[PDB]
Structures are given as structure tokens and as C-alpha cells.
Amino acid sequence: MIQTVVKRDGRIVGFNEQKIMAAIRKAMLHTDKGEDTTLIEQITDHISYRGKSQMSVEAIQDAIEMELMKSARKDVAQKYIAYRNQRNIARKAKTRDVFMSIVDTPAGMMMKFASETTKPFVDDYLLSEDVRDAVMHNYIHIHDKDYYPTKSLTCVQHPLDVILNHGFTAGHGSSRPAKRIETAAVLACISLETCQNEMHGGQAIPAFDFYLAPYVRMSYQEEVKNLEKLTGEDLSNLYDAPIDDYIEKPLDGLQGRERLEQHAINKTVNRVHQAMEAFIHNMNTIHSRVFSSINYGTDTSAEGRCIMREILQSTYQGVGNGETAIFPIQIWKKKRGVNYLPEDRNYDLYKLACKVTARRFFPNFLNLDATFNQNEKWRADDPERYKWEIATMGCRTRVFEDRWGEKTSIARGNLSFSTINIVKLAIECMGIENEKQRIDMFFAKLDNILDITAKQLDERFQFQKTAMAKQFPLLMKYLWVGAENLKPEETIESVINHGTLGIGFIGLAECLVALIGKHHGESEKAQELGLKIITYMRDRANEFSEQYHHNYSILATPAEGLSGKFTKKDRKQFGVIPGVTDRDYYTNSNHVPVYYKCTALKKAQIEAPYHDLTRGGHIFYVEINPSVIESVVDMMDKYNMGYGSVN
Amino acid sequence: DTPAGMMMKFASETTKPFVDDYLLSEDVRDAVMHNYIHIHDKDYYPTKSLTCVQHPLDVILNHGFTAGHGSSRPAKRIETAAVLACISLETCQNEMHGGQAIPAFDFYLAPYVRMSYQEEVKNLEKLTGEDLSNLYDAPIDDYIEKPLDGLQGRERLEQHAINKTVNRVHQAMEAFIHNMNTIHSRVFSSI
Amino acid sequence: EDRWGEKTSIARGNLSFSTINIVKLAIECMGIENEKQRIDMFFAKLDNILDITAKQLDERFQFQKTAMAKQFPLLMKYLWVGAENLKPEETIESVINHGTLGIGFI
Ligand SMILES: Nc1ncnc2c1ncn2[C@H]1C[C@H](O)[C@@H](COP(=O)(O)OP(=O)(O)OP(=O)(O)O)O1
Ligand SMILES: Nc1ncnc2c1ncn2[C@H]1C[C@H](O)[C@@H](COP(=O)(O)OP(=O)(O)OP(=O)(O)O)O1
Ligand SMILES: Nc1ncnc2c1ncn2[C@H]1C[C@H](O)[C@@H](COP(=O)(O)OP(=O)(O)OP(=O)(O)O)O1
Ligand SMILES: Nc1ncnc2c1ncn2[C@H]1C[C@H](O)[C@@H](COP(=O)(O)OP(=O)(O)OP(=O)(O)O)O1
Ligand SMILES: [Mg+2]
Ligand SMILES: [Mg+2]
């Protein structure tokens, strides 16, 4: 017989036959007909004679189910094998994440639930047949698929003045204009973090200098008024008194009316200083609690320089007890005639920027004079030059050109983008030995995959339109080109076309290995094909733009949600191949693989033409004194490099 | 209509039935299903949360806090104390499902009007070099406000302080009120 | 130690204890001869005796409460964890739980 049973916790107890009996009884009591001891006795006696000296709970339940199957009453087992499993899941949720297998902070868990619920429904009921077939076999990737039912857009560039000038009202919240520096950065943060809930991407504030520039004068005037309230003087000509730069130096060593004019500047500089560190800390804490970006570096006034110096000092110091802040992402604009050469006005700020970037990895650098960023309306005397300066985002996105509007990056955004798998096509075609036929097949398949991707992007577009204005309280009332003309319940079909659609690529070196023995950064013949394929994609993009009445651009994906999602599913189907499916990366859009020893010069040489070719986004990342970054910036200027991020 | 609302709706709808059919005894489920008991905030059951809490703001103000990759340092002025209070409220909201409250707001924010009044006086010393050191702990009955007309000397160089630490507090209070009222799209708050 | 207080040994003490015979169980488990089944019935009986013993201790604890503080003069008024808060008529329910209960062998 059986004498000892080991409980699940670990205790050892004696064999009681009255517990294997009540369990089956409760299972039977919910199955229409409910029987009596006639079968209970048989099952219990059969179990308690064939067993060993000591048993476990799980083994006994295995025996119970095995006997309840080999009976005539099989409607009692199907209510056993279910209750037991529910209890297993319940007792396994005290230390694990069982609820996720079926489909840490509370908010993150709820968001995971929602994402997993939404994704398959879109994958089934919304896409079309050809698109679905393409997606299933690992040919393309639709970025941010879980927000599809919400007719959402990617990002925007805030016209921050339209909110500071007048008052903004969202829901029951209302806010008046600003009248000093402290109440300006706060409103900038409010508007920057209020629009995340209306979009599924990053946020940016261009012209960080000009928009806040008028707000370094107001505090100066107020301080003068307070310094002439008690003194009885009539310092009425100090209001619009031209200034050279808001520098601060010690006060002792003067007297009279020249003593009450250096103090005001000192207090004003301190006031402006505290606000910027508050801004940085706020944006840094919000993330852990929200991508963000700010652009500056091309203002030659006296207030703009003050703001730039204050922000640079605050970032160089750090946050908290000296830690490096992760946000906001800061980007420095370089132009030939403003801040580059020693004779230019803002050389000192450039040197300070290099000093800080040598340590805290910000700001990045954006060549404002590249051959594909220049604009033919930038006038150095206008007080509104910023309207003709390119601006970029932390996601490496570019929105400059337009076939039906002006050439600006203000109050514009991106609407979607999808990446295309290219290594798989080369591996698939690898079969035939003749070289020419492999290239012919590659070009034959690339066209079809491109057509499918374009159709998917257009269908996304057609769905995104038809969204009422009220669904986006802030974006479609103050921060989009056509706002101020849209009624609360009108569709946004008349202003949506001022946007962009991207087609991204990933892993070109592997694609080259599958058609030649060397990648782009090892053999001269290799690059002649990479250039050709990128050129093919750009030409087809132009054709699609003409056909569908939209804007299309090529893209180097940021590699944030799609890093290994492609290589794993490719090793399984086709198995290991040397140097193609053996690393668990797939390299980025068009860089040189990180595992190949190469210098800065050669990498830049091989990469610049691609920068020219990819209008929708590009990068040039190099991993390592303030003089080091000078070499990087000079390298960017020498060639047509657009956006560098050395750090 | 906003994307966040739709995502939250999906989450709650996907979480309720699992709670009903996995993490409840038979009697509880029957009582729930027959309109006998209602469990407040059942969509948050797998997120083992708590509802309301009364904030000890002293620990947040005196020292700082290190959550995630963020950081902060002690507050040495009213305008940088109110903001920390708001930040604590909004950051603790995401880890619960109820409201947030601050008891004895007055006591918690009392010890910073005085620091402001000290910095304001120190600002006057660098202009009219004097001592003005009998005021750092001078006893003030009330920071009442009156016009600065009909005074002279050191008796007017002190009223000015009472007249400039009465407006920073005004701005900070109104900024707090506005900030906690714009959470419509940026939370339940009590003071 | 403690599970509802701080680590101290002042104004604290025992409440009661009981001792559990061990050898009788080994003697009873002597007919067995497998050398591995014999050692298991021992644990089988030990678990049950421990269960009943804990139940007895809890019952004695339940009876010990309901004792008015006026029948322990110089203990529930000056010498205990926190008796400066009780009254002659109040029972000592709110404070008794700072003591420890014991199980011994031989
Ligand atoms: N004394 C026992 N003798 C034999 N088998 C037992 C005994 N106790 C439990 N089992 C085994 C067989 C029963 O089919 C199965 C279910 O027992 P059950 O009493 O529901 O669980 P349990 O003993 O782990 O504790 P609980 O009281 O929490 O349910 O466990
Ligand atoms: N409502 C029911 N429907 C069907 N079978 C049931 C039901 N209740 C109990 N049973 C059967 C199957 C269970 O394996 C067996 C033991 O039930 P029970 O003691 O509630 O579970 P358990 O001991 O495995 O769970 P727990 O994790 O709560 O200890 O009885
Ligand atoms: N954190 C905040 N979030 C939202 N609104 C805020 C916040 N802080 C202040 N506000 C409000 C206060 C005002 O309504 C507006 C900013 O106005 P501001 O230029 O600072 O002064 P004001 O107009 O209130 O001053 P005055 O009292 O002289 O009229 O924004
Ligand atoms: N809006 C904000 N968001 C987040 N943290 C903030 C915000 N405003 C202030 N802080 C935090 C950052 C500072 O570390 C902390 C204390 O600020 P503050 O009183 O200016 O101290 P401090 O170290 O700058 O003092 P001081 O320069 O006057 O000696 O408050
Ligand atoms: Mg400070
Ligand atoms: Mg105001």
C-alpha cells in the first residue's frame, strides 16, 4: 500500500483515503448526472495498491486522471483536467509572469497588455491579403503596429511661439501668456509632454533660441524697475539700452548709477540660469516616470547667447550629484558664416560646446551647409531666419522638401514608416552559381517587395485620414500648419498631406556577402553594388511619389525595435551560413560592421555617398580631449556628411 | 478618443476575465456574477497596487530622491519646493490607482518663506554695503504688504524684503494651482 | 527577534511552553525493517504531534488574554513592553503579543 505522501511544500504526511474520495466527488457533482461511491471505491482501491511506499501529490493526481480516462464516465475527467490546470496557473502567478505567456511597474504592465491585445487584430482584420502574406514570411516590418487602430502620427516640430504669445486651452485647463523666463520654459515643457499622449513617437522644439529670446529682456526690465522703486531715481533709459552680452563680473569697484546697472544684469543672469537646469531636470525625470529634442546654435543676438551659455553650463555640470542626464537630447547647428570660422560671431560658444560634448556626449552635430540642406531664402538680416533652417529629431528623421508646399521643417511631421528585409532575398537567391543571374534575380525581387511596401504605406495613409480634430486637442489646434482653420468636428484630410512616408533598410553588409565574398568596407567592387541598389530604391521612391500623390523617402532605421527580430527567424529557416547568419545582429542600415577593424577616415569615405542618397534619415556614428571632436566635425564638413553623433 | 484612452480600455478589458476565472474562489465569483459584490478597481488585480496615500513631504524636501535614472537635490527656495511636491505627487500616481493628498500643507511649506526672506536681504547687501545681519533671524509678526512711501534709511531697506518675498510666494502658489489643473492631458490631488 | 517590533530583550518574556516526547515515536517505528520506510513514518507522526502542540499553545494564549491588568499589579503598570497605556479594567489583549511561545524536545 501507500503510507507516506510528500506535500508540495515539502512536508511528509500519512496516507488518508478520505481525500482522494472527496475530490472526485466534487468533480462529479457538476456533470449533469452525479454518481455515488460505486466508482469512487474502485478508483481509490486501484490507486492505493499498485503504488510504492511513498508518493507525491502530483503523481497521485496523474493516477487519478489516468484512471478517470479509462472508464465509462469520461465527462468527469474533462472537468478535472481543467480545474487542475487553472489552479496550477493560479499558484504559479505568485512568483512569475504567467499572465503574459497566454497572450514591472503597474503602468508598464498595463501597456504590455494593451499592445499584445491590439497587435493580432490589426494583423488579421485591417491589412490586406498580399500585405499580410508578405509580413508573415518575414519580408517587411511595420513599425509601431500596436497603435494602428488609433489613427496616430509619428512626430512633429513645435511652433512654440503660437502658445507663448497667446493663451492655450485644452480640456478644462487654460493658460495665459508668459511674462518672464521662469514661466516660459515651464510652458515649453508642458506643451512638449502634453502632445506625447497624442502621438506615438518623439518630440522636438526647434529654434530654442529665438522663441525664448524675447524673454531675457522682460526680466531685465522688471529687475530695473525694482532697483529704481526704492532709489527714487528715474532710470527710464535703461529699458531698451543696447547691450553687448549678458556677462557677469564682480561688482565692487564702482559707484553711483554705474553700480545699479551691473547688479541688475547679475540678478537677471542668475534668474535665467536656474530656469534652464530646472528644464533639464524636468525632462530627465519625466522619462523614467517621453522622447524629446531641442535645437539651437544660430542666433547672433545678446539674449540668444545668454540662453545658449546657460544651457551649456547646466548640461556640462550634470544632474543630481553629477550624473549625466539622458534627456533632453540636444543638437548643435553648424553654419559657415555664423559660428564656424574664428572670425565668426559665435566661435566661443562652439568651443564650449565641443568641451561639453567631449564629456557628457551631448550635443550632437548637424551640418547646416550640406549640399542637400541649403535653402535659397535664408537672409541674415531678417528677424525670422529660423523658418529656413533644417531641424532634426532624436530618431534621425528629416522633413525638409515638399512637392506642394514650402521648404521648411516647422509644424511638420512624419506619419509612418516600414523597414524592408534584404538579407533574406540575397540568401534565397544564393542558389545559382553564375554571378550575373544572381544580381538579375535580386533586382527582380526587390521591385516586387518595394511595390508591396508602398501599397502598405498608402493604405496606412488612407486609414489615418478621417480622424476628427477633437481626437488631438493640441496638435490640431496650435501645432500644425493648417490649424486655426479647422472646426472641432472636421476631418483633417485637408492638411494631412504636409507629411512624410519612409521606407527603411537594415543590414546591407550581409546582403553583399550573400552575393560576393566581401562586404562594402573590404573590396572596391563591393561598394559599386551598394550604391546601385540604394539608387534603385531612391528612383522607385520618386516613381511612387509621382504615382500616389504623396512624399516618399529612403531611411536608415534607428535600430530600436528591430535589432534581432530578423536574424533569429532566418537562422531557423535556412540555418547557419558563414558571415551572414552567425552573429545575432544583422548590421545597421549601411554602416561598416562593428566587428571589422577600421579607422574614422575610411568609414567616412565609404559612408558619405549613402548620406547623400538617404534623404529620410541618416547618421554617422563613431566611438572614441575637446580637440578630438574637432576632427569629427571637420570630417563632416569635408564631405557631404549631414548628421554626426560621435560620443 | 485620445490614443491613451483607447489603450487603457483595451488593457482593462483584457485583464478582467483572467481575474474572474483564475484568481477567485467559487463563492466570490458567484457573488460577483449575481450582482451582490462589486470589487473596486478589479482591472488592476494582477498589478498588486494600493489606492490612496498621505505624503510625508519632509523626506522629499530635505533630502532629494533617486528614481530610475533621475535625481534631485534639497530644495532651498519656495519656487523649487512646490515643484518637487508636484513631481512627487505625479510620480507616485503611476504606481497606484487612487488619489494623492498632502496633509498640513502649511507646516510643510512654512520653512522656505524664511529662506527666501534671507536670500532677498543678502541681495541688498551687495548693493549698499552694510551689515543688515540683525534681520536674518529678526522676529516677523506678519508679512503684510503696504506701500513703500514715507520711509528712509535702514527701515526702508527692510520693508523692501517683505515686499519682494510676498510676490515670489504668490507666483509659486498660482503656478502650483495651474499645474495641478492641467493634468487633463499631461490625477486626483488634495491639500 | 520579533515580527511586530524591534530587536530588544527588555520588558519582554515568555508566555508558556510545552515539551514534545520524541523517543516514543522512534520506539513505535521499530517494527519496520526497510531502513528507509522506518525513517519516514517518524516524520509522519512528528508532523501531527507538532500540529496539535501548536494548537494547544494557541488555545492557552487565547485563554491568557481576558486577564484584567489589575490582577498583575507591578507588571501591567511599570514592567512590560508598554503597559503605561492600560487601565485597571482594560484587558491586556493589545500588548500580550510581544512575548514568545516555545516548543522543546528531549
Ligand atoms: N492525505 C492524503 N492522502 C492521499 N492523497 C492525498 C492526501 N492529501 C492530498 N492528497 C492528494 C490526492 C488528492 O487528489 C489531491 C488533492 O488534495 P487536496 O486536499 O485538494 O490538496 P492539498 O492536500 O494539497 O491541500 P488543500 O486542503 O489546500 O487542498 O492531493
Ligand atoms: N469546481 C470544481 N470543478 C471540478 N473539479 C473540481 C472542482 N473543485 C475541485 N475539483 C477537483 C479537481 C481538483 O484537482 C481537486 C482538488 O480541488 P481543490 O482542493 O480545490 O484544489 P487544489 O488542492 O489542487 O488547489 P489549491 O491550489 O487551492 O490547493 O478537486
Ligand atoms: N506649471 C504651470 N503650468 C501651467 N500654467 C502655469 C504654470 N505656472 C504658471 N502657469 C500659468 C500662470 C499664468 O496663467 C501663465 C503664466 O503667466 P506669467 O507670465 O508667468 O504671469 P502672469 O500673467 O500670471 O502674471 P501677472 O500676475 O503679472 O499678471 O501660466
Ligand atoms: N521643475 C523641476 N523638475 C524637476 N526637478 C526640479 C525642478 N525644479 C527644481 N528641481 C530640482 C533640481 C535641483 O536639484 C533641486 C533643488 O533646486 P534648487 O533649490 O535650485 O537648488 P540648487 O542646488 O540649484 O541651489 P542654489 O544654486 O541656490 O545653491 O530641485
Ligand atoms: Mg538652483
Ligand atoms: Mg503671474
Author numbering:
A (entry chain B): 1 to 103, 120 to 305, 311 to 645, 652 to 674
B (entry chain A): 120 to 305, 311 to 315
C (entry chain C): 422 to 527
Please share text taken word for word from the publication where this structure appeared:
RNRs produce all four deoxyribonucleotides and are the only enzymes providing de novo building blocks for DNA replication and repair in all free-living organisms. Class III RNRs, which only function anaerobically, are dimers of an α subunit (NrdD) with a stable radical close to the active site, and binding sites for allosteric nucleotides. Here, we present structural, biochemical, and biophysical studies on the ATP-cone-containing NrdD from the human pathogen Prevotella copri, showing that the binding of dATP causes increased flexibility of the C-terminal glycyl radical-bearing domain, as well as a flap-like loop that binds across the top of the active site in the active form.
From the same micrographs that revealed the dATP-bound dimers we also resolved dATP-bound tetramers. Two dATP molecules are bound to each ATP-cone and one at each of the specificity sites, giving a total of 12 visible dATPs per tetramer. The tetramer reveals an arrangement of two dimers (chains A/B and C/D, respectively) in which the ATP-cones are all well-ordered and one ATP-cone from each pair mediates interactions between the dimers. The ATP-cones have an almost domain-swapped arrangement within each dimer relative to the core domains. Remarkably, the pair of ATP-cones is highly asymmetrically positioned with respect to the twofold axis of its core dimer, being displaced as a rigid body towards the other dimer. The asymmetric arrangement is associated with two distinct conformations of the linker 93–103 between the fourth helix of the ATP-cone and the core domain. The amount of buried surface area is small: 717 Å2, or around 1% of the total surface area of each dimer.
